[PDB]
Paper text:
We also solved the crystal structure of BmTrxR, being the first crystallographic structure of a TrxR from a nematode, which, surprisingly, is a fusion of a large TrxR domain with a Grx-like domain at the N-terminus lacking a typical Grx active site motif. Helminth TrxRs are members of the high molecular weight TrxR subfamily and are selenocysteine (Sec, U)-containing homodimeric flavoenzymes. They transfer reducing equivalents from NADPH to their flavin adenine dinucleotide (FAD) cofactor and, subsequently, to a pair of cysteines located at the si-face of the isoalloxazine ring. From there, electrons are transferred to the mobile Sec-containing C-terminal redox center of the symmetrical subunit, that, upon reduction of its Cys-Sec motif, reaches the solvent-exposed surface of the enzyme transferring electrons to the incoming oxidized Trx.
Auranofin is a gold-containing compound in which the Au(I) is tethered between a thioglucose and a triethylphosphine with a linear geometry. It is a well-known selenocysteine-cysteine interacting compound. Crystals of BmTrxR, were soaked with 500 μM NADPH and 4–5 equivalents of auranofin for 72 h, and the resulting structure was solved by molecular replacement at 3.1 Å. After the refinement process and geometry optimization of the model, an anomalous difference Fourier map was calculated from 40 to 3.1 Å and contoured at 7 σ. Its superimposition on the difference density map (Fo - Fc) contoured at the same σ and calculated on the refined BmTrxR structure without the metal, clearly shows the position of the gold atoms in the asymmetric unit; an electron density associated with the anomalous signal of a gold atom is present on C22 of subunit b. The gold atom is found at the expected distance for a Au–S bond (2.3 Å) with additional electron density detected from the other side of Au(I) with respect to C22. However, the low resolution of the structure and the incomplete occupancy of the metal (∼50%) prevented identification of the ligand. As expected, auranofin, a pan-TrxR inhibitor, also capable of targeting SmTGR, was here found to efficiently inhibit also BmTrxR and OvTrxR.
Residue numbers in the entry:
A (entry chain B): 10 to 586
B (entry chain A): 12 to 588
Amino acid sequence: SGSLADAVFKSACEERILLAYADYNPDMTKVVNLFSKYNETVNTVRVSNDAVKDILEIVGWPSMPLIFVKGNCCGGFKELYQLEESGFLNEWLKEHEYDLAIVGGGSGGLAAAKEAVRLGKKVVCLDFVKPSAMGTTWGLGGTCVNVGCIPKKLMHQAALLGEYIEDAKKFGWEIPEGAIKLNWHQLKNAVQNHIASLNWGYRVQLKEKSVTYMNSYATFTGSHELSVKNKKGKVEKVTADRFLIAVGLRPRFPDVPGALECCISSDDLFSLPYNPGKTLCVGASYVSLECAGFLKGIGNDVTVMVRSVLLRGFDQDMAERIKKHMTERGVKFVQCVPIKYERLKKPTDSEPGMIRVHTMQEDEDGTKEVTEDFNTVLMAIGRDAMTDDLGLDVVGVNRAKSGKIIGRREQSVSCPYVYAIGDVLYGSPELTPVAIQAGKVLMRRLFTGSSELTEYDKIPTTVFTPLEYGSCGLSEYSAIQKYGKENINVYHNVFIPLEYAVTERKEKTHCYCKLICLKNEQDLILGFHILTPNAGEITQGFAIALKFDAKKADFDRLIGIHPTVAENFTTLTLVKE
Amino acid sequence: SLADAVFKSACEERILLAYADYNPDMTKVVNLFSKYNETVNTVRVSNDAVKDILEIVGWPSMPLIFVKGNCCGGFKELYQLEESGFLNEWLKEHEYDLAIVGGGSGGLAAAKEAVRLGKKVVCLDFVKPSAMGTTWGLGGTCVNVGCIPKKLMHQAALLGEYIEDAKKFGWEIPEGAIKLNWHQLKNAVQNHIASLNWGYRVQLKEKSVTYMNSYATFTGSHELSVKNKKGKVEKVTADRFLIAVGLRPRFPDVPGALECCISSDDLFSLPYNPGKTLCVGASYVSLECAGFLKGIGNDVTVMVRSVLLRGFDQDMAERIKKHMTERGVKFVQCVPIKYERLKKPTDSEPGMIRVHTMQEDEDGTKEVTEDFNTVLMAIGRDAMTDDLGLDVVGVNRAKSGKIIGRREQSVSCPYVYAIGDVLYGSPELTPVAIQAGKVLMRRLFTGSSELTEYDKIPTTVFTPLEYGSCGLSEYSAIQKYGKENINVYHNVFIPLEYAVTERKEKTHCYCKLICLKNEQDLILGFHILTPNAGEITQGFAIALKFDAKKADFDRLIGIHPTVAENFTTLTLVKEDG
Ligand SMILES: Cc1cc2nc3c(=O)[nH]c(=O)nc-3n(C[C@H](O)[C@H](O)[C@H](O)COP(=O)(O)OP(=O)(O)OC[C@H]3O[C@@H](n4cnc5c(N)ncnc54)[C@H](O)[C@@H]3O)c2cc1C
Ligand SMILES: Cc1cc2nc3c(=O)[nH]c(=O)nc-3n(C[C@H](O)[C@H](O)[C@H](O)COP(=O)(O)OP(=O)(O)OC[C@H]3O[C@@H](n4cnc5c(N)ncnc54)[C@H](O)[C@@H]3O)c2cc1C
Ligand SMILES: Nc1ncnc2c1ncn2[C@@H]1O[C@H](COP(=O)(O)OP(=O)(O)O)[C@@H](O)[C@H]1OP(=O)(O)O
Ligand SMILES: [Au+]
Ligand code: NA
């Protein structure tokens, strides 16, 4: 019998051209002939049948005989003849400046860059941030470091520390009385200082590890040619055997009068030179709610305008609960969608501007136009791939209707030497640790010939709302939609974190956890959901249960740590219905 | 035929004989019960189920007798019961199905679970007062003088460090030293304890459990004599007894120890600020307390004579000592040779103790004294079971007062059981007592074969910087498997909540993962030093119920930004530092 996957995938990495076959199917001469044209030897592997099904499953091609070129799977002869007919194959076989060109200095980009060079490969990293419509820009690290997870969590923590001052008093700390205010200017500088240290850290790390970095915006001008333009306007050509597109997304604006003129975004909020003041958040996304949250927590009057539901994609039971709590915490929610934004005042520094927001509200006997004045309006409806000016048409990299790249796993489904990871990969969950993992693993497949795949199912999340929401697996609905109400047990409880027991927090009547189980398969766990302080820290480890098809019986036989919130998952007995 | 069927038959039936192949002397048994007008039901076990059944009940050989749902052993054991007159008394009707001695974690758990299975139950709690005369209500050690108050006083200490963080994040707090009022904290705490005490007392009445606030002693084979506070003495009778008395603080045979020093029992209800404080002992209790006492502003000293946290990973213990040292706690290897009272505590002010220590100078060794306001004895906790009359029912004890068990069954007496701290070699933890109680009741009254899982129990020490652990220490692992077969993976990190601060904790957070190299880095233990160690550890502990490998941690996607995600990216190997 033939070879196994292991042997195939390493020989594919080692060898310049590889043909992997099962039976001596015709057209294999036709291959050797094709590469004859280019003075190229063609190595060869007889695979076992025992192994065909797996190998095809990994590389994502349908049928038995496979070509690999400089460690990239092309498909069958059908695919190969297109590359040659197009002239691509001739260009591809030529020596190139870099082993791998990475477009994007984000979570995935930097992860991939570090992992690649660890496997001794010549790598170039291109980061450039086209500025917000208000003209905001930033350093190396991408969305998370500069305008995402990092600043957001720090501003959440600020808002929590506010609620902690009040707790301090109930525990006996004699704090001088008088309203305590939050100075925005201090928080903002505090945050931006850390972002600076990260930016610098990442820039160092690349130099320390021998990775070329260019602060230049890149566009494909040939089959293996990026044209890259820097801040000055200087333009260079870069060449590589492989490309990774790790471009991520940018805040979405709606096609409304005054939107791009009058409203800030995620990109702008974390470096504002003024206290945002009376604030309107437009959108139901996790971003809208998370933000909306902390601004109220640092003392601002906050309003959230939604089109229909909060957190579309998340458990709408859990979403409704967040809304009830955030409501009791003085955030105002409304059904409206603005029809126009009008600027009344420009911000100075040290002072915000004034926006008039136009809505159309409905009574019993009429529909009539309404306005309300806010200091600052945050647009937070979505994030979109900005890939038009990339020249993916030049390399023939297919995109979805959204700007996202359609993959065979991380491989462009059209072009075999161009790959994509993180937010820009069609249907990739838009989370930092996913980009990083997808990057690290891909590099280990390409340059080591391992069969390791990133696990994009059962990913734990946390929404950093005023009272945090942690989740893993299916929602109550999805489970019922899929399996039917008669076959789903939901176990749940309410509870009071001990840290809140001697206080009069509104959070005391809102903490809730629940466990969603397949009744016909020993209460196998499909999902869990918790509303609590430190939801992030609780969820992460319990998420590993779903990598083992854990049953409710496994949760019940686990001994608790007391006193913690987490132990509550150890003692669920009440059934939802 | 199989185990299940045997154990249910045993629950259903008054008298059961289980055999595999009949031996003589089995008539001699049925003849014995004939004397009691008693039917003797009978079961043929299959050979396949023999090995399991013996393993569950913990007896060596084939033939098994069960009496009112309790396993007695073979004929050898049965003739003892009859020769002793115990068998005749046992078969008589009794007032209660189960008498529970102790209103603690296990006692109350057991009582609730028993009555849920529709059984007549009596619960006996009484608190013999501290040497200083302190007493308290229902709920036992955890509720009144353990986990609950301790965690609340820890939380107080943390909120202190949070005020300082609030300022670095931009909260304008009026400047001037902020002091903590002990009297407020103490009343805050004791109010919650009151609500718990009252809650539990109600819950028993709500659920139809008889509660007697009376100290119990065995005066017959099936008779407890119980004395209440007034001095009134009552007789209680039952078919079964659960002993769940737990432990009490240990004092040394040193002049003035009991006179001059307080304990855990006294500390959480002190009418005074403890002031300058000496903690005697290296136990988790000594350190946890020393911790929060320093955190609310007191001058704290810890006297230990040997290692810290004996039983715990001495790497992690050393790390805690350095941190607690940087936080102003003073550690000394002396052991007091006498305590002398200088002042009585009075008028919500503390007293003054003179502590005598033997030190070494250049040419010799000499006596020394130092003055503390308050000395807390944290040597350990011991079983106070002499005045229980376990000698009457012939319940064997270990050299310490703890009850020797066949699992939770007294090894000597088949209708007396023990759980929680007083059960020889039970880990002394609230969730263990509770589980042991809940499960036992389900075994006794349902005939299930479910065992409490006493291996791989997660803990957290609530030191100023929390320590969470599960599984083997790095030492145990090497002792057991040998250095050549143990991988330790580890890393340092900085919780984001601390990034913009000047906290000492920034240079002390550390996690590590202990792995069996020769079995795919199977995980034997993990250890983390961090904020919220309790909440992080709980879920990761379930990994050890599935023999998780390092490869399972690496393929888990993280939640960002959290501390917990650090376990998903360990790459560095400890090389004997
Ligand atoms: C407000 C907010 C909060 C978030 N909070 C969380 C959270 O709590 N947890 C979490 O897991 N995720 C969170 N996310 C999502 C997370 O930040 C992203 O999913 C992640 O950063 C994506 O990484 P990436 O490398 O794929 O893209 P990015 O992080 O966006 O990096 C892409 C980089 O490529 C650069 N680039 C783009 N085009 C070019 C070009 N032509 N040439 C050169 N460089 C180019 C971009 O400017 C950017 O520098 C949050 C996102 C936002 C907006
Ligand atoms: C300071 C401190 C901190 C702790 N922190 C933690 C922690 O953080 N996490 C954790 O998991 N564990 C912790 N523990 C341990 C925990 O308190 C015990 O493990 C747990 O309470 C044991 O419960 P139990 O049911 O075995 O006994 P207990 O809760 O001690 O119940 C025994 C009760 O029975 C009563 N009794 C005794 N004799 C008689 C009699 N003859 N008749 C009637 N009643 C009687 C006693 O007065 C007492 O009320 C801590 C302990 C202490 C002291
Ligand atoms: N007379 C004494 N003086 C000072 N410390 C003491 C003491 N007796 C016990 N301790 C400490 O107080 C702690 C509590 O004792 P313990 O009975 O719980 O020990 P262990 O947990 O090892 O069984 C122990 O760490 C013990 O340290 P040693 O192991 O060095 O004894
Ligand atoms: Au290779
Ligand atoms: Na008890």
